[PDB]
C-alpha cells in the first residue's frame, strides 16, 4: 500500500499570508506524466471538498488562491492569501494504486488578535431540580486564542470533579473560539452551597443560590 505522510499536523496562519502543506508518498503516485495526487478541504460536519486534482489543477469553482505543486513522491498545497473561511482540515489523497489512501490530515487555523471571552453563568433550571439533578452551565464565547482555562469555585473553593467541557471549532467568519463548561451535581449537593463562580483565565461570573 502507498502511505501518505502530511506535514505539519497543525498550522496557524495570519490573514493574507501563505500556508504551505506538504504530502510525501512512500512510492511514486505518478505514471506517464500524470499525477494521481489530489487535495481536499473538509469543514466540520461536511464531506471533503476537492481543491486540486492531478497535483496542480484547480477543481471546478476553486479559487486561484489554492495551488498545488509536486511530482513523484513529493507534493505540496499552497493557499495565498489566507482567508477566514479557510480554517479547516486539509487532506492529500492518492488514486494511483488500489487501495486508494489519504494523508493523515493537517488542521489549518487562522491567527487573529487576542479577544477575551464573553462569559455567562446559569443556575440549574427548576425543571432539572424537580428530577433530582443540578447542572451549572458556563459559556465562554468568542475568544482567541483557543487555549483558555476555566475554573469553577463553589463558596470560594475551587471545584474540579463533575466538570465537563466542550469547545467549538474555529469560527469561519470572526476566527474566534467558544467553549461550554458544565458542572453537574446532585440537587442535594447543589442545595448545600451558596455561591457558584465560573472564571476564565480573570473574567469572573457568579450567582448565589436563592
Amino acid at each position: 500500500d502507498i502511505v501518505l505522510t502530511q506535514s505539519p499536523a497543525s498550522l496557524a496562519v495570519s490573514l493574507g499570508q501563505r500556508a504551505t502543506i506538504s504530502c510525501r508518498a512512500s512510492e511514486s503516485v505518478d505514471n506517464y506524466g500524470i499525477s494521481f495526487m489530489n487535495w481536499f478541504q473538509q469543514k466540520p460536519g461536511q464531506p471533503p471538498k476537492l481543491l486540486i486534482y492531478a497535483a496542480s489543477n484547480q477543481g471546478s469553482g476553486v479559487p486561484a488562491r489554492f495551488s498545488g505543486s509536486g511530482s513523484g513522491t513529493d507534493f505540496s498545497l499552497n493557499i495565498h492569501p489566507m482567508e477566514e473561511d479557510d480554517t479547516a482540515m486539509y487532506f492529500c489523497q492518492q488514486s494511483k494504486e488500489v487501495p486508494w489512501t489519504f494523508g493523515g490530515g493537517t488542521k489549518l487555523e487562522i491567527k487573529r488578535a487576542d479577544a477575551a471571552p464573553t462569559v455567562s453563568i446559569f443556575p440549574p433550571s427548576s425543571e432539572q431540580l424537580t428530577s433530582g439533578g443540578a447542572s451549572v452551565v458556563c459559556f465562554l464565547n468568542n475568544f482567541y486564542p483557543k487555549d483558555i482555562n476555566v475554573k469553577w469555585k463553589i463558596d470560594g473553593s475551587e471545584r474540579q470533579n463533575g466538570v465537563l467541557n466542550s469547545w467549538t471549532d474555529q469560527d469561519s467568519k470572526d476566527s474566534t473560539y467558544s467553549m461550554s463548561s458544565t458542572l453537574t451535581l446532585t440537587k442535594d449537593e447543589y442545595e448545600r452551597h451558596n455561591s457558584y463562580t465560573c472564571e476564565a483565565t480573570p473574567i469572573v461570573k457568579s450567582f448565589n443560590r436563592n
Partner: protein
Amino acid sequence: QVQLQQSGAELVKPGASVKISCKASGYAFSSYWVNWVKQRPGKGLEWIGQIYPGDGDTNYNGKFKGKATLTADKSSSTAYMQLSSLTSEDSAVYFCARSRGYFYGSTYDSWGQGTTLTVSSAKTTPPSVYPLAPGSSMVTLGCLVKGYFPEPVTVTWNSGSLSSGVHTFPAVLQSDLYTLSSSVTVPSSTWPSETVTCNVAHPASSTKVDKKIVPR
C-alpha cells in the same frame, strides 16, 4: 446538478449487519465509479472500495474484504454498502463519492452527505431539555440537552429563525449518555419582552421538545 444522497443514521447492536445506500442523480450513473470512505469520529479517512455500476465490478481494500460488500441497482441509480459482523470499531461516518477518470487524477468530485453508524448495546434514551435563563445590553440564554443516546440531536432557536449569535457545542459522552448545550445571545430589548424558545429533536427516540426560556 450532480448529487449523491445517502440513507440516514443507524444504531445497531454488535454482531448485526447494516446496509447503507447512496442514490445518484444528475448524471449517467452507470459510467462512473462509486467509492466508499470511512471516517472515525475524530480521525482521518480510509477508502473501503469502489464499484463500477455499469457492470457491477468491484475493487476492495483488503482491510475491508469480508467486512464490506458493495452492490449497485442501475435501475434506481443506487449504490449499496453492507457491513457485516459489526463491532464498536465499525462506528464511524461512511461516505459515498463519485470518482473521475485518469484525466482528472482519478479524483473524487462529488460526495454524499455521510451516514453515521453507531454500533452499541447501549439503550436509546431521549434527552431531557432544560432552559437556561440568567439568575437575574445583550443577554445570553441557553438550552441544556442532557442524557441522550445515540447521537445526534438537532437544536434550533425560535424554530431556526434565530440563527445569528448562536453557539451549539459538541456533545460530550459519559456513561453511555451524551450531553450538549447551546447558547444564544440577543439584545436585551428582545428578551424577555419577546419570546425565545429552544427546539430539540432527537430522531432516534422519535422525540421533539420545545421549551421557552422563561425569565426567573
